[PDB]
Ligand binder design. Structure first.
Ligand code: HEM
Ligand SMILES: Nc1ccc(Sc2ccc(N3C(=O)c4ccc(N)cc4C3=O)cc2)cc1
Length: 392
């Protein structure tokens, strides 16, 4: 089908034609759900519309939620202390300013050798067994360690922390024990950082004074951030890493460029981020009428920003937008959104892609994946594999 529909595990394999049908024939697409026409919403598939909408937080608010489901915030219980990705400026501004102190070049640099060691270990394990599931053995567990790092979790607690993480990530595709452990654990770690600060985002929040004094809205705000980190920082990286496998497999010319010139790997990472776009879409809510071409979207409606389509928009990337070109150097990709909410983890995600790719090519250059045997996670916003069978 080319008909608009929110993705399911069955449709994640190949949503691209439907994006194209939208972009060509109905770029400001009105969804009127037959069973609930009142919950109509709009859909944006073109690069230019998505780029400007992502930037224009005044018109396209994050404050009501990020899906197409009206009533989201209230329904899940997030009004009083929403995550930063559901705050607009000016409120979003000060918090973002404080937490950003934990997202610097030094934080991505200090974890990189840890990332490489783990990749090496799991790739050698796969190699030795002649293959296995590269998601289960590597692409799933890997991102948790990086999130743990950015949260200042002591390494000795990472295995416990990853267990909680995996339960939460699957549920958010449900996780009561894992939620409770994390909230118990971080409440304790937050208290600890009052007297033993580190360079991480939590330490920075606490050092800058958030949560002081059994109070606590501040504390819930740091806990909400921990959940933002866990729910946004894992499945996305796994979609990047796992989604890259079929793309590289089918293009031995493109692997050649990188095998002959590994310094093209940074650039190769951007192209992979472009085509995988693990956050394929997120919504905004119009705060006033807004006209894009011939469609006026009414104030108060949800708008789905198809980052995944914008990244494949032929108007921005040319008629071959659909194909891997590791030398593209794409401009203005939408993988990490654009504007106030631009992914704080962008450098961390890029690093994990760079290390994994470098070591895949160094250690498992003759590898096979069967696209038809990839199993995609459910859920309509992030596109990531649950399993990628891998033979070496
Ligand atoms: C390929 C992997 C990743 C992708 C595609 C991704 C994508 C995104 C997107 C699209 C947004 C803004 C959401 C919106 O438009 O409403 C976002 C925000 C954010 N991301 Fe990521 N992300 C990834 C990895 C990470 C990692 C590894 C971390 C932590 C180390 C991270 C931390 C954050 C944080 C804290 C925000 C909130 C920023 C704000 O709201 O001001 N992300 N990310
Ligand atoms: N890296 C990245 C990618 C995409 C997004 S969008 C996004 C939107 C909302 C959330 N999200 C929750 O659903 C949630 C539920 C309970 C909490 N206590 C915190 C959060 C949260 O951030 C997490 C992520 C956020 C971060």
């Amino acid at each position: 089908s080319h008909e608009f529909q929110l993705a399911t595990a069955e449709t994640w394999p190949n949503p691209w034609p439907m994006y194209r049908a939208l972009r060509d024939h109905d770029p400001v697409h009105h969804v009127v759900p037959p069973q609930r026409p009142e919950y109509d919403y709009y859909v944006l598939s073109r690069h230019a519309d998505v780029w400007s909408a992502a930037r224009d937080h005044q018109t396209f608010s994050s404050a009501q939620g990020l899906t197409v489901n009206y009533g989201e915030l209230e329904m899940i219980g997030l009004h009083d202390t929403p995550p930063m990705v559901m705050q607009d400026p000016p409120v979003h501004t000060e918090f973002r300013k404080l937490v950003s102190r934990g997202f610097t070049p030094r934080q991505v640099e200090t974890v990189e050798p840890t990332v490489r060691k783990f990749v090496v270990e799991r790739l050698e394990k796969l190699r030795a067994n002649g293959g296995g599931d590269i998601v289960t053995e590597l692409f799933k567990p890997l991102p948790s360690m990086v999130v743990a790092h950015y949260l200042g979790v002591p390494e000795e607690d990472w295995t416990q922390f990853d267990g909680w993480t995996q339960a939460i990530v699957a549920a958010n595709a449900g996780a009561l024990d894992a939620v409770g452990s994390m909230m118990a654990y971080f409440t304790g770690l937050i208290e600890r950082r009052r007297t033993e600060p580190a360079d991480d985002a939590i330490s920075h929040l606490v050092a800058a004074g958030v949560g002081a004094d059994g109070d606590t809205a501040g504390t819930l705000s740091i806990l909400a951030f921990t959940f933002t980190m866990v729910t946004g920082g894992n499945d996305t990286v796994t979609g990047m890493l796992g989604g890259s496998m079929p793309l590289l497999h089918r293009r031995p010319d493109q692997r050649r460029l990188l095998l002959d010139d590994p310094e093209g790997i940074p650039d190769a990472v951007e192209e992979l981020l472009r085509l995988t776009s693990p956050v394929q879409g997120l919504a905004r809510t119009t705060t006033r009428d807004v006209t894009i071409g011939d469609t006026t979207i009414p104030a108060g409606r949800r708008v789905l920003l198809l980052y995944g389509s914008a990244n494949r928009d032929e108007r921005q990337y040319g008629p071959d937008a659909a194909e891997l070109d590791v030398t593209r150097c794409p401009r203005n990709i939408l993988t990490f959104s654009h504007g106030a909410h631009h992914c704080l983890g962008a450098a961390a995600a890029r690093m994990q892609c760079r290390v994994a790719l470098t070591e895949l090519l160094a250690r498992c250059p003759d590898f096979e994946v069967a696209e038809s045997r990839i199993v995609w996670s459910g859920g309509s916003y992030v596109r990531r594999p649950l399993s990628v069978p891998f033979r070496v």
